[PDB]
Design a protein around this ligand. Structure first.
Ligand SMILES: [Zn+2]
Length: 27
């Protein structure tokens, strides 16, 4: 359960993380 920052989404499980979010939402 992670929260996509800079791209407003909630990922219930670690799904395909976003280019910006693997950075911003910390992954
Ligand atoms: Zn994202």
């Amino acid at each position: 359960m992670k929260a996509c920052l800079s791209c407003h989404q909630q990922i219930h499980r670690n799904a395909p993380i976003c280019p910006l979010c693997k950075a911003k939402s910390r992954s």
